[PDB]
Design a protein around this ligand. Sequence first.
Ligand SMILES: O=C(O)CCC(=O)C(=O)O
Ligand SMILES: [Mn+2]
Length: 201
Amino acid sequence: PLAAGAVILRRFAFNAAEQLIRDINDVASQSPFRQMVTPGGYTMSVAMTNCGHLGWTTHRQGYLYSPIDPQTNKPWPAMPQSFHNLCQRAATAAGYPDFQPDACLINRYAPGAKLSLHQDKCEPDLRAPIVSVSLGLPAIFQFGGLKRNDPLKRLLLEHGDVVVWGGESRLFYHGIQPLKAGFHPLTIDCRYNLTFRQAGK
DNA sequence: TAGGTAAATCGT
DNA sequence: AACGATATTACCT
Ligand SMILES: O=C(O)CCC(=O)C(=O)O
Ligand SMILES: [Mn+2]
């Protein structure tokens, strides 16, 4: 197993991928992908958007979840049923049958884009797991421990892979190494990631 | 207030 | 390039 309370479900979302990508395009047509600026003033290499009741955003003051897209000043698009159903099935297979996400972050990685090591730790209810779906180009996923200097596991995530963490591993450090360039028939030149969370309640 | 918080980039 | 430091400091609440 990946870790205590963590599992990788390889190719779990492979069959659902084409529909998921159609719905990514639908979400992005309403709340476009954008590269967010950190409180410290650095632009993230990942381009992102959100769907569902809450969306992850940056302010000058820190990180926060908001029901409103600060770019459009409209609510984030509703979570697609394809997203919700896939998340439910993956969470159940991973041993979290009661997971009820209210937020889905959509990350887009161009070649060279990365996500430096971090914890998912601004959700008020840490009992709920993280469900993380990979689509398109492959990436090296780092999965560590509770401390930033804890040893990292390095796992290639390929199209359709789903990673779930929670319980003992809920606050584990993780990230994505700079994306290698390449081709995938469904995303062409990028990697998408769907990150489902219970961000409120 | 004065204790807590810095975490993406930079250096090795 | 895989790690560690970032603070023997600035910026807040
Ligand atoms: O893209 C991934 O696989 C990781 C995404 C992630 O950790 C995040 O967006 O917080
Ligand atoms: Mn994360």
